[PDB]
Short mmCIF file of all heavy atoms in Angstrom, two decimals:
data_model
loop_
_atom_site.label_atom_id
_atom_site.label_comp_id
_atom_site.label_asym_id
_atom_site.label_seq_id
_atom_site.Cartn_x
_atom_site.Cartn_y
_atom_site.Cartn_z
N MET D 1 24.83 -33.63 14.11
CA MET D 1 23.68 -34.19 13.28
C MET D 1 24.02 -33.95 11.78
O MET D 1 23.05 -34.14 11.02
CB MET D 1 22.39 -33.59 13.70
N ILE D 2 25.19 -33.48 11.39
CA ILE D 2 25.50 -33.30 9.96
C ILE D 2 25.45 -34.45 9.30
O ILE D 2 26.00 -35.60 9.69
CB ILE D 2 26.86 -32.60 9.90
CG1 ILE D 2 27.10 -32.11 8.54
CG2 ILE D 2 28.01 -33.45 10.30
CD1 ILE D 2 27.71 -30.63 8.35
N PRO D 3 24.79 -34.49 8.07
CA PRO D 3 24.72 -35.78 7.30
C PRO D 3 26.11 -35.89 6.55
O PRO D 3 26.75 -34.92 6.10
CB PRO D 3 23.73 -35.44 6.16
CG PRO D 3 23.21 -34.06 6.36
CD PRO D 3 23.83 -33.52 7.56
N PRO D 4 26.57 -37.16 6.45
CA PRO D 4 27.93 -37.44 5.78
C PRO D 4 27.84 -37.20 4.29
O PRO D 4 28.95 -37.02 3.67
CB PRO D 4 28.18 -38.91 6.17
CG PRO D 4 26.96 -39.46 6.68
CD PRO D 4 25.94 -38.39 6.96
N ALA D 5 26.64 -37.15 3.72
CA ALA D 5 26.59 -36.95 2.27
C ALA D 5 27.00 -35.52 1.92
O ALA D 5 27.81 -35.39 0.84
CB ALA D 5 25.03 -37.06 1.85
N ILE D 6 26.75 -34.51 2.72
CA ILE D 6 27.32 -33.18 2.40
C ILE D 6 28.75 -33.09 2.75
O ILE D 6 29.45 -32.27 2.14
CB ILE D 6 26.48 -32.00 2.98
CG1 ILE D 6 26.48 -32.14 4.60
CG2 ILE D 6 25.03 -31.96 2.46
CD1 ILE D 6 25.36 -31.36 5.25
N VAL D 7 29.26 -33.82 3.59
CA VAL D 7 30.70 -33.89 3.87
C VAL D 7 31.44 -34.42 2.66
O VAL D 7 32.51 -33.94 2.35
CB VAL D 7 30.96 -34.75 5.17
CG1 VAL D 7 32.43 -34.85 5.46
CG2 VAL D 7 30.30 -34.15 6.43
N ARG D 8 30.86 -35.54 2.03
CA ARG D 8 31.48 -35.95 0.80
C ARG D 8 31.26 -34.97 -0.26
O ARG D 8 32.10 -34.71 -1.12
CB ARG D 8 30.79 -37.27 0.41
CG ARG D 8 31.51 -37.88 -0.75
CD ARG D 8 31.25 -39.28 -0.97
NE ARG D 8 32.24 -40.18 -0.20
CZ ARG D 8 33.52 -40.20 -0.51
NH1 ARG D 8 34.08 -39.46 -1.44
NH2 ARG D 8 34.32 -41.02 0.25
N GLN D 9 30.18 -34.26 -0.24
CA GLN D 9 29.90 -33.17 -1.28
C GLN D 9 31.01 -32.12 -1.28
O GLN D 9 31.65 -32.08 -2.27
CB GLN D 9 28.44 -32.62 -1.10
CG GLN D 9 28.10 -31.40 -1.88
CD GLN D 9 26.68 -30.98 -1.85
OE1 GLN D 9 25.97 -31.40 -0.89
NE2 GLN D 9 26.24 -30.20 -2.82
N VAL D 10 31.26 -31.52 -0.14
CA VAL D 10 32.25 -30.40 -0.07
C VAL D 10 33.49 -30.85 -0.65
O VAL D 10 34.10 -30.20 -1.54
CB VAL D 10 32.47 -30.04 1.37
CG1 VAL D 10 33.87 -29.40 1.61
CG2 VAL D 10 31.48 -29.02 1.89
N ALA D 11 34.00 -32.08 -0.41
CA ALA D 11 35.29 -32.61 -0.88
C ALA D 11 35.09 -32.69 -2.57
O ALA D 11 36.00 -32.38 -3.26
CB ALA D 11 35.69 -33.87 -0.35
N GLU D 12 34.04 -33.39 -2.97
CA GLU D 12 33.88 -33.55 -4.38
C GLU D 12 33.71 -32.21 -5.17
O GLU D 12 34.34 -32.12 -6.26
CB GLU D 12 32.63 -34.46 -4.66
CG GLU D 12 32.74 -35.23 -6.06
CD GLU D 12 33.77 -36.35 -6.08
OE1 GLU D 12 34.22 -36.83 -5.01
OE2 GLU D 12 33.97 -36.85 -7.20
N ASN D 13 32.94 -31.29 -4.60
CA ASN D 13 32.79 -30.00 -5.19
C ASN D 13 34.21 -29.20 -5.24
O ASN D 13 34.46 -28.54 -6.23
CB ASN D 13 31.79 -29.13 -4.51
CG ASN D 13 30.34 -29.69 -4.61
OD1 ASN D 13 30.09 -30.88 -4.31
ND2 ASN D 13 29.50 -28.93 -5.03
N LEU D 14 35.00 -29.33 -4.20
CA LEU D 14 36.35 -28.78 -4.41
C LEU D 14 37.16 -29.39 -5.45
O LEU D 14 37.76 -28.71 -6.35
CB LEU D 14 37.04 -28.79 -3.01
CG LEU D 14 38.37 -28.04 -2.93
CD1 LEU D 14 38.79 -27.90 -1.49
CD2 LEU D 14 39.56 -28.64 -3.69
N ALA D 15 37.10 -30.75 -5.44
CA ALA D 15 37.89 -31.45 -6.52
C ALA D 15 37.51 -31.22 -7.86
O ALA D 15 38.39 -31.24 -8.80
CB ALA D 15 37.86 -32.95 -6.19
N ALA D 16 36.27 -30.95 -8.08
CA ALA D 16 35.72 -30.80 -9.49
C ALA D 16 35.70 -29.26 -9.92
O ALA D 16 35.57 -29.01 -11.09
CB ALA D 16 34.25 -31.26 -9.52
N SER D 17 35.94 -28.38 -8.93
CA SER D 17 35.98 -26.94 -9.25
C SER D 17 37.41 -26.59 -9.69
O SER D 17 38.25 -27.41 -9.95
CB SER D 17 35.52 -26.13 -8.05
OG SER D 17 36.60 -25.98 -7.20
N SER D 18 37.71 -25.29 -9.74
CA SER D 18 39.06 -24.82 -10.09
C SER D 18 40.03 -24.80 -8.79
O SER D 18 41.05 -24.25 -8.89
CB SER D 18 39.08 -23.36 -10.53
OG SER D 18 37.85 -23.20 -11.50
N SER D 19 39.59 -25.57 -7.85
CA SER D 19 40.30 -25.93 -6.63
C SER D 19 40.45 -24.60 -5.74
O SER D 19 40.14 -23.56 -6.21
CB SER D 19 41.68 -26.52 -7.02
OG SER D 19 41.54 -27.91 -7.50
N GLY D 20 41.19 -24.75 -4.61
CA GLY D 20 41.31 -23.67 -3.66
C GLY D 20 40.60 -24.01 -2.38
O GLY D 20 41.01 -24.83 -1.61
N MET D 21 39.52 -23.34 -2.09
CA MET D 21 38.73 -23.48 -0.94
C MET D 21 37.24 -23.67 -1.26
O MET D 21 36.72 -23.06 -2.32
CB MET D 21 38.90 -22.22 0.02
CG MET D 21 38.33 -22.49 1.35
SD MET D 21 38.54 -20.95 2.36
CE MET D 21 37.56 -21.33 3.81
N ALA D 22 36.58 -24.45 -0.44
CA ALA D 22 35.11 -24.68 -0.75
C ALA D 22 34.37 -24.65 0.63
O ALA D 22 34.88 -24.92 1.73
CB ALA D 22 34.90 -26.01 -1.43
N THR D 23 33.11 -24.41 0.52
CA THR D 23 32.16 -24.33 1.70
C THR D 23 30.88 -24.77 1.24
O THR D 23 30.62 -25.09 0.15
CB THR D 23 32.21 -22.91 2.35
OG1 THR D 23 31.61 -22.96 3.65
CG2 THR D 23 31.56 -21.89 1.50
N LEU D 24 29.85 -24.57 2.14
CA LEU D 24 28.56 -25.16 1.87
C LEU D 24 27.47 -24.05 2.28
O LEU D 24 27.68 -23.24 3.16
CB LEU D 24 28.27 -26.38 2.67
CG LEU D 24 26.83 -27.01 2.70
CD1 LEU D 24 26.83 -27.99 1.55
CD2 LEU D 24 26.56 -27.61 4.06
N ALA D 25 26.31 -24.07 1.52
CA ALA D 25 25.21 -23.19 1.85
C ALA D 25 23.95 -23.99 1.72
O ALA D 25 23.81 -24.85 1.03
CB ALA D 25 25.20 -21.98 0.83
N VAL D 26 22.88 -23.36 2.42
CA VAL D 26 21.64 -23.85 2.37
C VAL D 26 20.68 -22.75 2.01
O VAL D 26 20.83 -21.63 2.27
CB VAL D 26 21.17 -24.49 3.72
CG1 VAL D 26 22.29 -25.55 4.14
CG2 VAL D 26 21.02 -23.44 4.76
N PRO D 27 19.48 -23.06 1.39
CA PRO D 27 18.52 -22.03 1.06
C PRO D 27 17.86 -21.58 2.37
O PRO D 27 17.61 -22.29 3.29
CB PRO D 27 17.53 -22.70 0.18
CG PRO D 27 17.67 -24.19 0.38
CD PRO D 27 19.15 -24.32 0.76
N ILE D 28 17.55 -20.27 2.37
CA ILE D 28 16.93 -19.59 3.55
C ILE D 28 15.38 -19.38 3.15
O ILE D 28 15.20 -18.86 2.07
CB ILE D 28 17.59 -18.23 3.88
CG1 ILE D 28 18.83 -18.46 4.84
CG2 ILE D 28 16.70 -17.28 4.48
CD1 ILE D 28 19.54 -17.21 5.18
N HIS D 29 14.56 -19.71 4.05
CA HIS D 29 13.20 -19.66 3.86
C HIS D 29 12.39 -18.94 5.03
O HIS D 29 11.22 -18.82 4.89
CB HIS D 29 12.58 -21.03 3.59
CG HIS D 29 13.06 -21.71 2.35
ND1 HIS D 29 13.44 -23.02 2.40
CD2 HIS D 29 13.33 -21.23 1.11
CE1 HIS D 29 13.91 -23.25 1.11
NE2 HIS D 29 13.78 -22.28 0.40
N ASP D 30 13.11 -18.57 5.97
CA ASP D 30 12.54 -17.86 7.15
C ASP D 30 13.05 -16.39 7.03
O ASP D 30 14.30 -16.15 7.09
CB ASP D 30 12.85 -18.48 8.52
CG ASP D 30 12.39 -17.78 9.71
OD1 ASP D 30 11.34 -17.10 9.54
OD2 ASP D 30 12.98 -17.96 10.79
N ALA D 31 12.08 -15.47 7.06
CA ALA D 31 12.42 -13.97 6.96
C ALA D 31 13.28 -13.63 8.21
O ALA D 31 14.30 -12.79 7.95
CB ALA D 31 11.20 -13.20 6.82
N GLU D 32 12.91 -14.02 9.35
CA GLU D 32 13.74 -13.74 10.48
C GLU D 32 15.29 -14.18 10.40
O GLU D 32 16.09 -13.39 10.60
CB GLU D 32 13.21 -14.41 11.77
CG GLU D 32 14.20 -14.77 12.94
CD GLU D 32 13.58 -14.91 14.20
OE1 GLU D 32 12.34 -14.73 14.28
OE2 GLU D 32 14.31 -15.27 15.14
N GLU D 33 15.38 -15.39 9.73
CA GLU D 33 16.69 -15.91 9.40
C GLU D 33 17.42 -14.92 8.42
O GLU D 33 18.58 -14.55 8.53
CB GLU D 33 16.65 -17.22 8.88
CG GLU D 33 17.91 -17.99 8.74
CD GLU D 33 17.70 -19.38 8.12
OE1 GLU D 33 16.65 -19.71 7.49
OE2 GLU D 33 18.65 -20.30 8.34
N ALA D 34 16.66 -14.44 7.49
CA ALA D 34 17.21 -13.64 6.42
C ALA D 34 17.59 -12.30 7.02
O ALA D 34 18.68 -11.71 6.48
CB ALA D 34 16.21 -13.44 5.34
N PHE D 35 17.11 -11.75 8.03
CA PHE D 35 17.43 -10.51 8.70
C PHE D 35 18.13 -10.75 10.09
O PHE D 35 18.09 -9.93 10.99
CB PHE D 35 16.18 -9.57 8.88
CG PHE D 35 15.69 -9.22 7.54
CD1 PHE D 35 14.48 -9.75 7.15
CD2 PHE D 35 16.25 -8.18 6.74
CE1 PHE D 35 13.91 -9.43 5.87
CE2 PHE D 35 15.70 -7.81 5.50
CZ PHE D 35 14.51 -8.43 5.10
N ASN D 36 18.76 -12.02 10.24
CA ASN D 36 19.36 -12.27 11.45
C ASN D 36 20.95 -12.19 11.20
O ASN D 36 21.50 -12.98 10.53
CB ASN D 36 19.10 -13.65 12.01
CG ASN D 36 19.62 -14.03 13.34
OD1 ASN D 36 20.37 -13.24 13.86
ND2 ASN D 36 19.27 -15.12 13.87
N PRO D 37 21.62 -11.19 11.85
CA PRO D 37 23.00 -11.01 11.51
C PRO D 37 23.85 -12.23 12.03
O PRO D 37 24.96 -12.40 11.37
CB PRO D 37 23.36 -9.73 12.41
CG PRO D 37 22.07 -9.02 12.60
CD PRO D 37 21.05 -10.03 12.66
N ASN D 38 23.46 -12.96 12.91
CA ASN D 38 24.09 -14.19 13.27
C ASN D 38 24.06 -15.31 12.18
O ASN D 38 24.90 -16.17 12.25
CB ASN D 38 23.60 -14.77 14.63
CG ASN D 38 23.98 -13.91 15.79
OD1 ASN D 38 25.28 -13.73 15.97
ND2 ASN D 38 23.14 -13.54 16.55
#
C-alpha cells in the first residue's frame, strides 16, 4: 500500500542531497508507538 509519491521522493531527496544513502521517516503521534521498541 506504499504510495508511489514517496518512492519518487526518496530518489529525488538522494539526488538533491550530498548523495550516499537515503531513507524515509514519518511523524509519530501515538505514545505507545513512541515507546515501542519495534
Side-chain angles (χ1 to χ4, degrees), residues 2-38:
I2 188 135
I6 59 199
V7 177
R8 185 160 272 300
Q9 174 171 16
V10 154
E12 201 77 11
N13 294 57
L14 189 165
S17 82
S18 321
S19 290
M21 188 181 174
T23 191
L24 174 93
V26 306
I28 273 176
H29 298 136
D30 178 25
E32 147 161 358
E33 192 181 20
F35 297 102
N36 189 353
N38 285 307

